[PDB]
Enzyme design. Sequence first.
Site, PDB file in Angstrom:
ATOM      1  N   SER A 659      61.488  25.145  42.001  1.00 43.52           N
ATOM      2  CA  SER A 659      60.441  25.277  43.046  1.00 43.52           C
ATOM      3  C   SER A 659      61.061  24.994  44.431  1.00 43.52           C
ATOM      4  CB  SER A 659      59.273  24.385  42.697  1.00 43.52           C
ATOM      5  OG  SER A 659      58.084  24.844  43.313  1.00 43.52           O
ATOM      6  N   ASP A 737      54.113  32.895  36.939  1.00 41.36           N
ATOM      7  CA  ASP A 737      53.982  31.751  37.884  1.00 41.36           C
ATOM      8  C   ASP A 737      52.921  32.076  38.946  1.00 41.36           C
ATOM      9  OD1 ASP A 737      54.243  29.571  39.570  1.00 41.36           O
ATOM     10  OD2 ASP A 737      56.459  29.554  39.478  1.00 41.36           O
ATOM     11  N   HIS A 769      55.004  28.388  36.132  1.00 44.41           N
ATOM     12  CA  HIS A 769      55.797  27.392  36.902  1.00 44.41           C
ATOM     13  C   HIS A 769      56.603  26.510  35.935  1.00 44.41           C
ATOM     14  CE1 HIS A 769      56.885  25.962  40.783  1.00 44.41           C
ATOM     15  NE2 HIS A 769      56.434  24.717  40.587  1.00 44.41           N
TER      16      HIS A 769
END
Lengths: 794, 782
Positions: A659, A737, A769
């Site tokens: 991320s 995601d 994610h």
Amino acid sequence: PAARFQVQKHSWDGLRSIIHGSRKAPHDFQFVQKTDESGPHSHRLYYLGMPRENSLLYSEIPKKVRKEALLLLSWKQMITSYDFHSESGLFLFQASNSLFHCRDGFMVSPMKPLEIKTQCSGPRMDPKICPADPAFFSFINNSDLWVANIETGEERRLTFCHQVLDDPKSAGVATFVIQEEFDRFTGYWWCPTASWEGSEGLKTLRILYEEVDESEVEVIHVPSPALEERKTDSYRYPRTGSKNPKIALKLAEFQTDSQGKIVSTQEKELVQPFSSLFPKVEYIARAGWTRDGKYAWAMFLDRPQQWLQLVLLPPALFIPSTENEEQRLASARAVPRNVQPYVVYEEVTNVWINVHDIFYPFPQSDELCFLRANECKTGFCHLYKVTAVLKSQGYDWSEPFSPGEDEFKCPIKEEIALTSGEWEVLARHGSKIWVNEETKLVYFQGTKDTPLEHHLYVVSYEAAGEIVRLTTPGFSHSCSMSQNFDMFVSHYSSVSTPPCVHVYKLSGPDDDPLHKQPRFWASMMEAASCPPDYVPPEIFHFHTRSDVRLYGMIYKPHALQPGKKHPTVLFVYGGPQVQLVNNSFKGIKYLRLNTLASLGYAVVVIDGRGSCQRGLRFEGALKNQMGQVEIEDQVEGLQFVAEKYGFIDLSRVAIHGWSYGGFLSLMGLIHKPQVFKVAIAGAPVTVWMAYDTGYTERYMDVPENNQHGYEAGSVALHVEKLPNEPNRLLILHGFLDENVHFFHTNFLVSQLIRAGKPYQLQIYPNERHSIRCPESGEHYEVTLLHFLQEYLHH
Amino acid sequence: PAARFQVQKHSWDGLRSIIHGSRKAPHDFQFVQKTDGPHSHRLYYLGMPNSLLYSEIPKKLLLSWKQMLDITSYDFHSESGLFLFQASNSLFHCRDGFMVSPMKPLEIKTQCSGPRMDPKICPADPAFFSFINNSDLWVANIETGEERRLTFCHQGLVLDDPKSAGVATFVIQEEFDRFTGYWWCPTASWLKTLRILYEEVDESEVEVIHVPSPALEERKTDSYRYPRTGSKNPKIALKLAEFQTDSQGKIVSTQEKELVQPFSSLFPKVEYIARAGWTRDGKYAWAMFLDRPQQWLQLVLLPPALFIPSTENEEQRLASARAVPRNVQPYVVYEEVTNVWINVHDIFYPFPQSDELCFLRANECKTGFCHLYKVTAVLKSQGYDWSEPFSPGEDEFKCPIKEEIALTSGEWEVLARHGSKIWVNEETKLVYFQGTKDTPLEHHLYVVSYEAAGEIVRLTTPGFSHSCSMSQNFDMFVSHYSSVSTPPCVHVYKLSGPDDDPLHKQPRFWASMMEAASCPPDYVPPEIFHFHTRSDVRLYGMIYKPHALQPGKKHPTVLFVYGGPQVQLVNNSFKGIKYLRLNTLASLGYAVVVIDGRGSCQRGLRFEGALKNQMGQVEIEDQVEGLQFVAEKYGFIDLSRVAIHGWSYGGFLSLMGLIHKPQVFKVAIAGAPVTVWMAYDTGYTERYMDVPENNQHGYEAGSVALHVEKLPNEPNRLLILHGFLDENVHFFHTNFLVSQLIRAGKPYQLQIYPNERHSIRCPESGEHYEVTLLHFLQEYLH
């Protein structure tokens, strides 16, 4: 010479068996007293645990202990969440695709969960028992609020804002950007008390709720999990600069007779539209009621998230909603000039308001006393006893008006600090405080002792005096209090020791309740066996050249021979709302880092500036410059580790992260190519103009005001400064995601092709994610090992 | 032995400058006569330095590419000299006195919101011209500017708006190569009325799949109707859109006209309308109807009088139903049956009448080889009450055939697919046509008499594949001709000689338009070969020999593959424009082998029919049989180091090769690969592979993602390229294969082309693809 350490290269099927090899707690507590003092047990502990797969369990606490002998407790049988009513012992829980209930005289062995029927369409999401009458309960169904009665079996609909892209309105639901960025997962709130309005008969029950209109919110398409069907799901995703939902707070009265039937239902709108009483209010962050139900309350943030305010809304300020412009004015004239919204507390910053869950208003004897957490005052989150004057300035509600600066702002009578210093009271991330009015003590967790350990403390809200620590040091604790404040649980662990869950009894004389000793009582779970090859990480600290302290972990190369320089995986996140370096077990969340260590990799972790649990000004190093500060703190923290410990070959450094860490990884490779030879970027943010508002605006302003900042910190716009050399960049991304859209990977790959740069890419078609399914995770870890095995050299 | 050749290993920026080094054609011809006079004819055509150009043909060297204007396709109407085309997203026109210098393109105004797709001029009156807009049929007037909507199938929402008129659906465009869904009647009747045949279509029950939009920034998908093999195809019908016009050129009235019995009762078992049109006299509309199996084809004649005005008044309709005479009727004038599949052929030329109907038709089913047939058909009205609902079947409308001549025969084919066409001189009684009569590796121009199946004369000169267009006055023809070694020229030929012997009119070179432009200086062309399999069946292959060869050295080999039906890679035409990268691959010292295995095109139906129900299985064994022969004949193959490469079917065949033959192929580079046939459409799959409910065993076996367990456990043996926006072979195939590879604990490598569909069109994407291909082979083909 043979100074460099070369890792034992394995076959694919070998790396697969090394990763499969390295794969070989309770929570959600409710204390209840027994009140049959001829039997052996003093309390009962209800909680959620996997004996496998999650379920509802109870444990008995005995009156007399085992003295000098450790006591385990049996998990007796009887599901992500549940609601409970302590006055009647009624459990309500969403399980399977429906709702279920059960009662708890105290049962011997499991009872079968009596299913609640429905003539509603889809699933019943977000259920809550009515606190005022446990005969009732609420739920959402097709983006609208329902109420039902377990006893009679009668369901009724209370909101009608919904019946796809022609249906943007919805009631009692928390929109996306509220769920993911402000961590609120509901948009309705039970009034705790039950008024008896009218002239003769009936009992009125109220519900505060957030009405919501997502028409002007941009739509975006994420692929459907069911890959076979080849379809997408529509998302009301607002991107930074674009429009958030139109919001309002609204009431839902409904009367019921003695025999328990629902008579009248009624929508109620604010006397003056929400948007006219509160111009420049963008997000409802939190909401609830006072203990007596005298005022429902909310926390309103402004768009730049630099202005919070707690406001009261008396039910009287709510009129019945109708389209009759005639009729509206009648009920508007019927509202007394006494009644008014009171803006109590107001937090203003040059940085950003972090939302804090702590707000405990005291019942009134005129005035209003309450407890509030406030990080804007001193730069560190501390408790405060605030008294506010509710003086009604007398409003004509039939004629409209524009409010003026501090229209409803209450005079502050007193505002005491109950805590102070450069530590903080844990107030975000589901952290709650417990207040005992019998003794005037307030129980809270904090970093008082150290940033690396979460600890339970008690202080008096009468006198801001002695603060007593209750959890034993050398560990980080997540704690849950009893309602009777006689016992508490601690789920705790340390870098070296896996997690345990102990029950403690607060003991000693009652004439001094502050100084009650936390005596160990019984254990719920003792430290599980450490993984075979698990050597724990070593926490260190260093100072930047700017004399600001930074903490770092390191995973020592197992079976280390001093004088050998090993290759180093730097693991990173280095973004806001997170702390990776703290004294709690990391083996469950990060054994991959251990697995790396065991094949002879150095694995460094560094909480650079712009991370959680160091107060505001530390987090604020980010403000309007994401990427441009965090990577220097990583380099420094890596270089320091190379001086202190002798085993870091700096020629072979591999920055890897997910991320924001995926983002940093690429930024690392861009701004420091001579430092990091390879990047492994997992689900990276490549363009900030593409990420959502709640998050991005808070830290980077709006693209119009921070042009130079958005572009400099967007790695897809700086692709020309990525390596001309292959095998220096591996991109991992979950197709599904919904936080960081695959578009980022896609857009970066598009930009790499235009600038003529090489890249390896890996795709997780069913993961989002977080990589959930084991097979996907194994494949991830194997690719990491293999990529580093072939390429992390020179 | 140190005789193994190692390719020079380059830096990436090195490889990039080698691929940038590498990279450093008129069509659609229309003949007009001057009838004066220094010049005789005048060529109109398309070309680049893409728009309308002309060349002046003299009465007695290269030709000047003049310009008309101050464009993919145009319509032309010789009588008025009117040009209609779709430059920008607007419509333009212009006339050709015979202009000397370039005139301006006159623009057409509109009321309509969206674009005006599929523009056509009315043959009967050039004042009018049609177009599609929000999937409905519109009619305008170039002279007046008056527009008028005829079909009303669309509202203004989608997914609630499934019906549509005059458009060709997805499977119709991508697997039957029909791009329009309407057809002008070429005549008028008298005030005068003007007809259009069109396909009304209901996609209500067709499965919707979402695809990402080219604008990645907005992040929104497009919604197609993609019917997967086994699912419902669109509900279809043929319809008549008539309208009267007065003398001033106003549209005074329109009319929707449905067939007197519903389309699905008249013609049960008809799934697709392959082709349609009218006879030159506008007497009969016609259509080619297939069944869902695609093993049954019938050519049908629809007389207009069988069409009744649409109304909700079921008494008013019955009134019309009575008024249609019992005489008028559909005539099934032809039927093609088979046990393999019906390839769709464009050639159908009915002769005008004045009970008989003579016509030329391409037929491959009869003798297994596509050939021209003269067919006289008995149209004998049976008499029907159209007022009573009735359900016929099979051969109700099946005409007696009175004669069936064969104008061509021999184990070769007449070309009739993907817009190949015959030219018929009714005066000289000759039919000019294209064919493989001389060799499959060349496309030659031939003439035969449609009177007597006599001598077939060849017009094009041997050694070269040709693509030709005839002058409408059968005096001249152009030939866009190329060869393996020589780039494409465009020569103009004049059919000279005695008029009293037309068949033997000699093609005498008149003028050149384009001359073979110098090859990219590093270009050494491939050389064609043949060998026989163990079944003694002949296969053709090309090879690209390693540049600057040292005999006794074994080189690393890249077997480039398609191997799918409807395609032929191996023939005698310049390959160094589309397949320049194969020459670059040679220029670094890789051997590159291409082999048209069984299943491929241009060898008749039984050679193609080897695939039937076994896609994957038959194809690889041929590719190896070739590869093996290649190593023996040319002594420079290192078999220990053979890569496989291909796009679409060729991606599918790389993954098959690496499954079924790992000992042979060290690596696969699979591009846009079909990894699950059960996910692909009805048009393609059902033809070749039957229907999943029938051919369970064969679908499973040909899905490379159900056999992932048998892919390599070694990394760097498999590279998956795919265009993110691919609308033919959805990215899903790659996605599904990647999910299957992870379950099985198998390594892969992925390249995405986020702005590309099925083919890479953008230069930068194409360069990156060729650099990645070279880098991957340089490091891992060892």
